[PDB]
Amino acid sequence: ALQTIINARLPGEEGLWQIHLQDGKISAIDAQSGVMPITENSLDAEQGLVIPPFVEPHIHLDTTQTAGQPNWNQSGTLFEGIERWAERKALLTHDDVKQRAWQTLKWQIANGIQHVRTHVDVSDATLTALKAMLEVKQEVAPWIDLQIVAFPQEGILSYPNGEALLEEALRLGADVVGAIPHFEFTREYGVESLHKTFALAQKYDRLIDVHCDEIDDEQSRFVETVAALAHHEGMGARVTASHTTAMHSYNGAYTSRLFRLLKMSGINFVANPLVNIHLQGRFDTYPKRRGITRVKEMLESGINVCFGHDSVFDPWYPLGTANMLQVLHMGLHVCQLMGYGQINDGLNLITHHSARTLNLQDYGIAAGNSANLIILPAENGFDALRRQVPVRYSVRGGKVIASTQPAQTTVYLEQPEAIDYKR
Amino acid sequence: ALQTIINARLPGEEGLWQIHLQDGKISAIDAQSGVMPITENSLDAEQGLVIPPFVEPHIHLDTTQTAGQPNWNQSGTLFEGIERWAERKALLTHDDVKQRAWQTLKWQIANGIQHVRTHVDVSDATLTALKAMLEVKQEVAPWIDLQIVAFPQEGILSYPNGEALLEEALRLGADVVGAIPHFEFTREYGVESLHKTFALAQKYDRLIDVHCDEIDDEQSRFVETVAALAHHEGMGARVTASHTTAMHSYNGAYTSRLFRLLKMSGINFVANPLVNIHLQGRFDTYPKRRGITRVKEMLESGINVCFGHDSVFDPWYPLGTANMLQVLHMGLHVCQLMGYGQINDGLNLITHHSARTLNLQDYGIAAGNSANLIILPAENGFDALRRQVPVRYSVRGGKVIASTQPAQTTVYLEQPEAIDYKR
Ligand SMILES: [Fe+3]
Ligand SMILES: [Fe+3]
Ligand SMILES: [Mg+2]
Ligand SMILES: [Mg+2]
């Protein structure tokens, strides 16, 4: 079994480091004064970057891999997506959900993702997708720690038996309580739905992740209730507000007042760049707003924010290979986090900040933690992002669970020359 | 003791008038058909304007005189102001508050101000500033009638024990119940805080003065709740909405609907020109809104509105000499009340309208009232405002409590010539 990771670079640290492993955990981390020789039981990072695993804080595994079945979304709109999904209803079975979820999970394992939070639609009396996902969670456990959010997609108060079904999902084992206040019939139902969500989270000791203000409506302010209730209950660390795309459209004075509460509350925020740029701004003609939440300002204020993929290869988002560096690339561009340090520090948005969002208790390259880490064939976060590098090795419990042999590119000039896209 | 004020001009009246004094009160007011001779016990207004005392309806004596201690606010922003104040915390003592409050009160006495309403931060378990201000109120009584507002600066529902501290302040003697709904964590806390404020005012028979919608947010509409609750309780005369700067940003249709209620409710409004032009519009780039409430429209609709200085020589407003004619000058410009009559009638915004805001029962040059009046060396309100004249004499209880010997300016041309800035 592997005993050491050598010649590793660490974000924010100078030089090379050696990570000692024992009994599936990291026993010690020591600085090197030069390059160490390889040997039996040593995994050579080759001066590449070593980081804790990538994290997917927001994905819908119940709908993944269904694009084009039975028909393709040709307009690309949300409206048509709903119609295309409806045409596939006859194929939505226990086994179908498990097969598709596992296909995307394998791409995630290949991409160094060891922690995933999936929302599962529980606005279904049969709870078909939820029952399937609970089995998938157990099956994939050796490779990925999967959290399941009971997501009442059609609303809690605006759908028949919505609250009873949400609670049933928690009784069956869902890890997180979801909500979608802006989709409820009225603002009052929206606010009330959040009180019910928090009461359920406290009753069952579960986390909360709300699809919050995902709409280009400057009056959609459910985020202040999410933060206020979290502050009142002293549970900010266990609470997440996903999307908050309406914040992109708020006036600055209200946003400034709100930020004081967001910081005090300690809640987490998830932005989903690939999907937000695609589905937001659809009611504008020109100019067209970007529609991503205030990521740059959150970072400047010390508010925890991170990035999710949201959807993969389905009616709502036809693209994706479940790659977090690709999600990060889009977010840095749309949010204009394009200075060198902003890009280099970008890795935090898909590693540490996401681990905090999932309330993980065993995460990070530190002595005593499980030996879960990945190796990128790049010098730092900037280099990894610019070249969109694959994950050379993914290690979990001190064992290799994925590896990618890099592509090899050659140009035939006066003589053959290898191209690695470095200067 | 003084027995008469002679050769006085009165706003809106033709000619000169004689004001007879007896036992500290105004016994009678009689018109003169010409200029009266001076004599023992007669104070000669010298055809200057005589008016009841200036009033300061909104000031923060607990923070006054602290600019630059220990450091100056260099950006001039609200954010930096909060930080600069925090650096002075070690100096905030009982004696410090009394010393600074008294310094500004002396400037006010010098400026003919005999009525002052100060807000005091009661979001402090030790209520240090409040205890100091209650002593200052007693000490300054011979010269100024000071009203104290228990101002829950950090919110009523959004600060630990906020409501209990607000009530404690009333039990200690604060004259007015304050609130700040737009600063509460949520809109619901904002509305609820107003119900609590009104309940306390009725329980203790106190006035109300709310820091209301002081934010460039077109959705901040707490003013309608303040007016509706006042109308319901039949207590409009005892209620004031300070700032209402959000009203500057409302659409016209909602404002028109709202105005019917504002008039019916009978509540008072305070605009703070020097501070509002400075702190509002800070989130705009260009064009930049003025951010003062709808003063001109309130006047046209018969809604009582008046002007306050707000802050004097502190982190939030570095300037000021506590001069009401200077406050009026700024308000007339920013609110575009620049026609001759609008400027001339401007004095009402710092005298009669402010007295109504403070619910004063002994105010005005009328027989039976206490002999509290001031003399301006000007022909009318327009002239006093244009030349920013000092207060020649301030009389309280029939005795002179302040006087200013005017500056004397000379230009040396072919011969020396006195310049008084009159044409
Ligand atoms: Fe989602
Ligand atoms: Fe104030
Ligand atoms: Mg979605
Ligand atoms: Mg203020």
CA distance B156 to A134: 45
Token output for A370: 């499980």
Q: Are residues A151 and A3 in the same domain?
A: no
CA distance A294 to A341: 18
Q: Which of B188, B215, B219 sits opposite A191 (nearest CB)?
A: B188
Residues 6+ apart with CB under 8 A from A98: A132, A135, A136
Find the B86 Cα to ligand 4 centroid distance in Å.
16
- In total, chain B counts a number of residues equal to 423
Q: Are residues A184 and A302 in the same domain?
A: yes
Q: Are residues B40 and B93 in the same domain?
A: no
**CA B128 and chain centroid, separation:** 24
Residues 6+ apart with CB under 8 A from B143: B105, B109, B114, B396, B401
Residue pairs spanning A and B at CB distance below 8 A: 40
Q: Are residues B59 and B117 in the same domain?
A: yes
Find, among A238, A248, A293, the residue nearest to A268 by Cα.
Answer: A238
Residues 6+ apart with CB under 8 A from B223: B212, B213, B241, B244, B246, B247, B258, B262
Q: Are residues B62 and B38 in the same domain?
A: no
Find, among A300, A295, A234, the residue nearest to A270 by Cα.
Answer: A295
Find, among A163, A144, A47, the residue nearest to A101 by Cα.
Answer: A144
- Per-residue 3-state assignment (H helix, E strand, C coil) for chain A: CCCEEEEEECCCCCCEEEEEEECCEEEEEEEECCCCCCCCCEEECCCCEEECCEEEEEECCCCCCCCCCCCCCCCCCHHHHHHHHHCCHHHCCHHHHHHHHHHHHHHHHHCCEEEEEEEEECCCCCCHHHHHHHHHHHHHCCCCEEEEEEECCCCCCCCCCHHHHHHHHHHCCCCEEEECHHHCCCHHHHHHHHHHHHHHHHHHCCEEEEEECCCCCCCCCHHHHHHHHHHHHCCHHHEEEEECHHHHHCCHHHHHHHHHHHHHHCCEEEECHHHHHHHCCCCCCCCCCCCCCCHHHHHHCCCCEEECCECCCECCECCCCCCHHHHHHHHHHHCCCCCHHHHHHHHHHHCHHHHHHCCCCCCCCCCCCECCEEEECCCCHHHHHHHCCCCCEEEECCEEEEECCCCCEEEECCCEEEECCCC
**Which of B361, B382, B400 is where one domain is finished?**
B361
Active-site residue flag, A214: yes
Find, among B106, B335, B54, the residue nearest to B343 by Cα.
Answer: B335
Q: Are residues B245 and B191 in the same domain?
A: yes
Nearest CA to CA, how far is A224 from chain B (Å)? 6
Residues of A engaging B, defined by a Cβ cutoff of 8 Å = 191, 218-219, 221, 224-225, 227-228, 231, 251-257, 261
Cα-based distances in Å from B102 to A267, A350, B144: 45, 57, 11
Residue A26 belongs to a domain with what CATH number? 2.30.40.10
Q: Are residues A69 and A173 in the same domain?
A: yes
Q: Are B362 and B55 in contact (CB under 8 A)?
A: no
Find, among B219, B202, B198, B220, the residue nearest to B210 by Cα.
Answer: B198
Catalytic residue from among A139, A184, A214, A218: A214
Q: Are B349 and B306 in contact (CB under 8 A)?
A: yes
Find, among A400, A402, A371, A375, the residue nearest to A389 by Cα.
Answer: A375
Peptide bond preceding B287 in cis form (omega within 30 of 0): yes
Q: Which helix (H) or strand (E) holds B17?
A: strand B16-22
Q: Are residues A387 and A348 in the same domain?
A: no
Find, among A175, A168, A54, the residue nearest to A114 by Cα.
Answer: A54
Residue B82 belongs to a domain with what CATH number? 3.20.20.140
Cβ–Cβ of A253/B283 closer than 8 Å?
yes
Domain of A409 in residue numbering reads as 1-53+362-423
Number of domains in chain B: 2
**Which of B332, B361, B390 is where one domain is finished?**
B361
Adjacent-strand bridge partners of A117: A147
Q: Which ligand is nearest to the CA of A271?
A: 1
Find the B211 Cα to ligand 2 centroid distance in Å.
6
Find, among B306, B256, B231, the residue nearest to B55 by Cα.
Answer: B306
**Which of A310, A334, A361 is where one domain is finished?**
A361
Find the A376 Cα to ligand 1 centroid distance in Å.
28
Q: Are B320 and B274 in contact (CB under 8 A)?
A: yes
The residue type found at B137 is: K
Q: Are residues A352 and A373 in the same domain?
A: no
Peptide bond preceding B70 in cis form (omega within 30 of 0): yes
Closest B-chain CA to A257: B183
Catalytic residue from among B168, B214, B300, B379: B214
Find the A249 Cα to ligand 1 centroid distance in Å.
20
Q: How many CB atoms lie within 10 A of CB B285?
A: 7
CA A75, A77, A83, A87 dihedral sign is positive
Find, among B285, B238, B242, the residue nearest to B266 by Cα.
Answer: B238
Q: Are residues B357 and B369 in the same domain?
A: no
Q: Are residues A102 and A34 in the same domain?
A: no
Find, among A56, A279, A270, A212, the residue nearest to A148 by Cα.
Answer: A56
Q: Are residues A251 and A380 in the same domain?
A: no
Q: Would you give the DSSP letter of residue B293?
A: -
Closest B-chain CA to A253: B216
